[PDB]
Amino acid sequence: MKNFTTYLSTAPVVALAWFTVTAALLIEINRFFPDPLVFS
Amino acid sequence: AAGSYPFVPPSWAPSVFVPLTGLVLPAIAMATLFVYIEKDN
Amino acid sequence: LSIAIFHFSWKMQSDVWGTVTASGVSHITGGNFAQSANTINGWLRDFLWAQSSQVIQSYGSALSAYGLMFLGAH
Amino acid sequence: DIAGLTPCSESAAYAKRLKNEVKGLNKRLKNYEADSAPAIALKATIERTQNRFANYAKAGLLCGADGLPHLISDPGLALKYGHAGEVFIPTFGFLYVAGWIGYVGRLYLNMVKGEAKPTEKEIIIDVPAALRLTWQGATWPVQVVAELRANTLTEKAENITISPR
Amino acid sequence: FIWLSGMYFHGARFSNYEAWLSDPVHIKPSAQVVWPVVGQEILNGDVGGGFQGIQITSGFFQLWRASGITSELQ
Amino acid sequence: WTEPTLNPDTPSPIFGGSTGGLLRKAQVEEFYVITWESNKEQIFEMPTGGAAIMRKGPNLLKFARKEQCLALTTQLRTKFKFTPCFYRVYPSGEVQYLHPKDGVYPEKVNAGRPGVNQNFRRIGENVNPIKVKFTGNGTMDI
Amino acid sequence: ATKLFPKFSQGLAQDPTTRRIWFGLAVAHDFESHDGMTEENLYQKIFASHFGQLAIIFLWTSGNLFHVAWQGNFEQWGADPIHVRPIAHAIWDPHFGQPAVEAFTRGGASGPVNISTSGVYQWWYTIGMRTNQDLYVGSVFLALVSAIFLFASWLHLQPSFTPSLSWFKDAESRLNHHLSGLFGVSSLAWTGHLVHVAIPESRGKHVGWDNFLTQLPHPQGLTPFWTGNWAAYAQNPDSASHVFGTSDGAGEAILTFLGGFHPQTQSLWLTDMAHHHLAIAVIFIVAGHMYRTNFGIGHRMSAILDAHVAPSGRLGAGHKGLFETVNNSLHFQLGLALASVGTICSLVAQHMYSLPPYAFLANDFTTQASLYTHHQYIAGFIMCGAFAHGAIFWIRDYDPEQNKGNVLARMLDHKEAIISHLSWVSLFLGFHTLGLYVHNDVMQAFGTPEKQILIEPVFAQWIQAAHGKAFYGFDLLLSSSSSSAASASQTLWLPGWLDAINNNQNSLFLTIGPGDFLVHHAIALGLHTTTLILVKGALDARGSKLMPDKKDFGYSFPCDGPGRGGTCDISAYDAFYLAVFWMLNTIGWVTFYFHWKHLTLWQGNVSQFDESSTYLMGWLRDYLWLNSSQLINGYNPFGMNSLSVWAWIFLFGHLVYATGFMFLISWRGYWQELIETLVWAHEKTPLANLVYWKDKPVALSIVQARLVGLTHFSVGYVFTYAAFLIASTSGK
Amino acid sequence: MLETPVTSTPEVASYLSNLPAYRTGVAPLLRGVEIGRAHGFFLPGPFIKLGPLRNVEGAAEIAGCLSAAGLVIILAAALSIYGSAMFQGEPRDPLQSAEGWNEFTSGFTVGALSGVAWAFACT
């Protein structure tokens, strides 16, 4: 597990995770607060 | 040599200048240069 | 390969694909491959430019994804 | 007002853009039975459209004859006339997150520098320490200035390699 | 295999194969449905057959038909 | 050591022939002749294209490029650990012993070699082009 | 054996390959490199070469006048300039088929002819020319001038008439003479044409060489000028009812400041153009009397440059030690000249569309479009040369020890700062300018146009309101009459500037929308990027971590080998080579914005541009695709019309453009080895082996192919667009 | 370079040696009239049947042989400049010499135009 976690830390894996979370966050934000053209 | 301006080209000028400049003139230039370019030193 | 796919796209739309009507068939392009393909302009005016209308006007329709990809591809 | 930009609330074209756009979806709803998922969906698109085409006007979005909302960039114009929510306020929001991301990155870089083989902590990222530095960038503006007023944000010009002139 | 299996699954749950079977001519094949977000739901066009998705061009519906597949349980 | 003299009657390796060898330059301009001494009859690869059976003892092959001869030279010096030597036969017959032209293959230092093209300054101590402008002389050579 | 073709380069002369022929044409006008070149001889050769270029320009102009007179419709077009189409020349094509002979008979002729888009007609009318004789006389005159310059090239190259290097390095005087004589006495001289010939001709009154010494330009005469009452020359201006070339509505003024444009011609008034040249001429002559000569009173340039050092030492030694740098470097001077000429070449295009300076120029849309695009492109090539020669200066003629602490040496000190900061601006402009186009395109595709981001160009609208534009409603400066500036000009050009600026049928300060905002920022991206490429090459011209000895390797060298990873395109010639592409991309966007903004203006569908431009899809379908419909139909399986040549050129441009790719995508090696096989085949082929090549066939040089492909690439981009810009504007 | 059945068949190595170019011995002019007529007579063909006025009556053969004559003359000039740019030092076969080529070119120009006339007299 020490070496599996090392692999899950490599750049390609970490970037895949970080982006997925960021993408999902934006998607979910528009899902509940849609059409955000202005900050009102 | 007629009307007002005495140097108005004749109607056959195009039927001579265009043929000469584009077929005859270029051939002379290309051939003359070719000889100079290949001219030995 | 590009010319081959263009040759198939145009030949077929012009000489095969169409609707069988009473006495005659209506080809997608009305059988213009023969006289319009012997020149490079015909391949641009009667093929590229003429058939590019659908993709350039796909915006706003279910096909709008292809218009976006068409430019993205360029 | 501003540059001949009429408010979308008073913009007739904006109203037509609503009428014609909801009609184009109320003609795609007819070719479907009242309860089909196709129809539940097209009715949501009509509701969402009718909400957006009103949230915008209620936000006082000036739009031209086109009927499409326009944004004001000048801080004075945006502030003086209550158009700060567009561009102005959004500007700082990005700047804060942008500097946050950059500051956290440099914090990590300068920690792995020195540490054993700094080159192998850039490929196999130290997710633990990377997760202990993310929140440190929340008050990045406070820390960044404290570094300018201490000469530690930049490097001395006699320690940076330069190409032969 | 994963790719092939996914095609059958997408053609099992999110597809109009059964509707197409009854009227193959006037119904366009579709087996890709987009989520209703960022107005991307426009991509779900009326392929006919009580279905709003993306017209596929992979020839799988006609392949399944010639395999006998007559339901989304197969 | 005495600059070896070419024996133009040296058995040549066995090869059917290739559309990739000498052209008009060999006669109008010049050509080169590599020679070596094998221990056994072995197949080698020609720097021009193909395979050839080298003969036992003296061998002689002709090329139209020095790099081609040197290529075979390194091949023999490495694949067969031979010590090949090549010349430059001009159209008049003037053979010029090209390699090693000393007996000691270039890589090895040997007293009796003068220093040619040797600047005794750091590459970054060369003058500016303006100092050699209108002088028709390179900054490195000056 | 050794050849003679490359007389200047003995190395090329001794080259056994064919490269000697190719390079012999390239390294031909780089005398600084010629074998046995002295600085004085270089200057004398350049000075004579200048005369040769001046002979070509005048000979070129004479030919245009001759063909317009011998094969043109000037008098007919002059009678009806809003219906007759100016004829450039006749098409004597021994290959034309009968339908081609019929379709190209237009503009009123008896044979196939070519309508002109140069706009010489409108210009020659405005300046006084009315008949074909005026053209014949002018052509002969200019032809004689060309002959004179040609003799001068010979005279100034023959001992005793060859200027010394000292004369070539006499700056103070040269500038004084050029500013007072070349610029000033040539502007007052022009006012003399206008006041005496152009203005009278526009008011219907032949004042030619036959009656100029007897025709009073002004009714009062020189009396008002002598008495100081100069105002008399600005009374009774031509009324709005005036018709160009007619006494109808004609006035008596010779020099005035009405502003705006003549009503019928829709072009700047002649009197306002007369007083302009008079005013500028006075300034130029006075400015000419500044530098020192051989009398005493005057300014030594060196002193001025050395006396300008910031006391805070922020600019180091300031401009001290720069006079010699500019005076002893012919690349530094050429770069400044190209930069100045380039920038002014653009002013001509930006100020000639807004303010038509010639009669009936606006009416001719095709001319207007083809003139903007011509100058804007020529300007771009000139700018590339400016930086190009600047990089050559850094390597061939920069003394790092003399320029020590001067503003020029403290530039390389912060070379990274300048280059890196140009990188950030380019990225910022690029990431955002494009992002707000894709964002709008997505909204257009998803049928959510309201959601698309449309930022308003408020900053530009205010500069427009400041000039008097009222549409915006900002009431700023001229927009507000109660202002100081507005009230001050109210008695001069103001009354006209407004009438004209507040008319939407012309191009004076056109209404800008959010569509213009995006394209303007895109133009900035091209300006910054193209600049970054050239600036990076100029600063790294003689230095770089990868190639610290670039100066020793000269300016144009292929690469430093595959060593250090890759040195491909590392020479400062390759910053030019690459910058050219970005320059074409930048100008492409600017000349496409002009054309669409104006085609929509001329067709009356301004909303078309005000909406389609917001998203990129509109630019392609509504502009390139929609307008190309006619051009492509120049020749179809049913027939051909007068737009056949443009359709043929349009495709021809694509061919040359694509051919350029091979020389850029493919590299020297596959071709070289291929040529080797070809050489073998010919030597073996019987009956053909008899004939042989004198020069050994070799593949194009690494740098050579770069320029050959780029010339093909550029020629295409020009012909392909010239075809569109002219056949789409004319077709309607 | 690789003696192949093709580039060795004594029949084909003999056919080549009777062609008026490998037949060294015949005076270069007579080795030019031979080659000239051979390359000149067949030239009119392509212009007579597929040229601009190929479907006009009577003037389809005069125009073919007139055009051919034109090219024949063009071919002559190229032959001449070739010798001038190849025999600067007037480099066995006298054809491969300065004077040799100047007499071959002339034989070709007077043989090809004679062949072009033979083809018109054969229509």
Ligand code: CLA
């Ligand atoms: C990014 C560059 C930029 C640009 C091109 C402009 C451009 C403009 N700004 Mg501005 N502004 C900027 C940055 C910029 N601003 C920033 C960073 C701030 C925050 C400090 C402001 C805060 C600001 C204010 C408070 C106001 C402007 C205003 C204006 C407009 C007229 C003011 C002027 O003459 O000059 C530019 C002025 C400034 C840059 C700041 C000084 C404030 C000005 C001088 C007071 C002028 C008030 C008066 C009503 C303006 C008359 C405009 C005319 C059409 C009637 C003008 C189009 C005026 C406006 O039109 O709003 C109603 C105004 O009131 N700006």
Ligand code: CLA
């Ligand atoms: C800690 C990461 C980091 C930071 C703080 C910066 C900071 C900077 N970069 Mg940079 N850059 C980065 C990463 C980073 N970069 C990476 C990974 C690349 C390769 C794609 C680049 C490529 C790049 C270029 C080509 C340029 C800059 C430029 C700049 C300067 C202009 C400011 C700007 O707008 O940012 C610009 C940032 C970018 C253009 C792209 C980077 C954006 C990424 C997403 C941020 C990095 C996040 C990082 C992975 C977080 C690590 C966290 C850690 C726990 C693992 C600026 C000081 C410009 C410059 O030199 O100014 C003179 C410029 O020309 N950067």
Ligand code: CLA
């Ligand atoms: C009154 C004295 C005088 C005058 C009139 C000139 C004039 C000239 N000199 Mg000169 N010179 C002088 C004194 C003078 N010199 C002295 C005393 C010296 C000794 C130091 C020199 C040393 C010298 C050198 C070494 C050189 C010159 C050169 C030149 C020519 C520049 C090339 C050109 O075309 O410019 C023309 C520019 C204008 C006429 C005005 C510029 C206006 C801009 C560019 C555009 C304006 C366009 C307008 C707005 C609209 C036009 C519309 C329509 C007409 C198209 C030019 C004709 C160069 C040369 O020989 O070229 C052949 C050059 O090499 N001179």
Ligand code: CLA
């Ligand atoms: C359509 C073709 C094209 C495009 C789009 C570009 C674009 C660009 N060129 Mg360029 N160029 C081209 C052709 C092109 N060039 C050609 C044919 C040549 C001749 C060889 C050159 C020669 C050239 C030179 C010499 C230079 C440039 C430079 C630049 C950059 C200028 C700075 C900028 O605007 O940053 C803006 C950034 C963008 C527009 C990128 C958009 C953001 C990306 C696409 C999103 C991130 C990825 C996304 C999420 C998904 C994609 C990846 C995913 C699949 C993983 C820019 C990105 C300059 C440079 O390098 O900058 C320092 C420069 O030096 N170019």
Ligand SMILES: CC1=C(/C=C/C(C)=C\C=C\C(C)=C/C=C/C=C(C)\C=C\C=C(C)\C=C\C2=C(C)C[C@@H](O)CC2(C)C)C(C)(C)CCC1
């Ligand atoms: C008001 C405002 C705008 C006004 C802009 C105007 C008028 C002027 C702008 C000047 C600007 C934007 C910038 C000048 C910057 C100059 C310097 C020297 C600053 C450099 C910043 C640096 C070096 C910091 C880098 C960072 C550090 C060290 C750590 C982290 O913070 C990350 C990072 C990289 C940010 C407009 C355009 C209208 C629009 C509306 C917002």
Ligand SMILES: CC1=C(/C=C/C(C)=C\C=C\C(C)=C\C=C\C=C(C)\C=C\C=C(C)/C=C/C2=C(C)CCCC2(C)C)C(C)(C)CCC1
């Ligand atoms: C041709 C032409 C042109 C060109 C031009 C140029 C470039 C130049 C010219 C020039 C000229 C042709 C000029 C004129 C001159 C004349 C004169 C100049 C005369 C005068 C007279 C008198 C009598 C006066 C005297 C005096 C003076 C001088 C000074 C003061 C005093 C007095 C007044 C006494 C163009 C292209 C535009 C187009 C059209 C054609």
Ligand SMILES: CC1=C(C/C=C(\C)CCC[C@H](C)CCC[C@H](C)CCCC(C)C)C(=O)c2ccccc2C1=O
């Ligand atoms: C095609 C190609 C060749 C081969 C191209 C050759 C050999 C050019 C052949 C041209 C012949 C001679 C005909 C050209 C016709 C010209 C239009 C004639 C006039 C050209 C000038 C005199 C103006 C290269 O050598 C090369 C080298 C490096 C990078 C890319 C390439 C590359 O792409």
Ligand code: SF4
């Ligand atoms: S590929 Fe060509 S340009 Fe690149 S390093 Fe090698 S030789 Fe030089």
Ligand SMILES: [Ca+2]
């Ligand atoms: Ca007159």
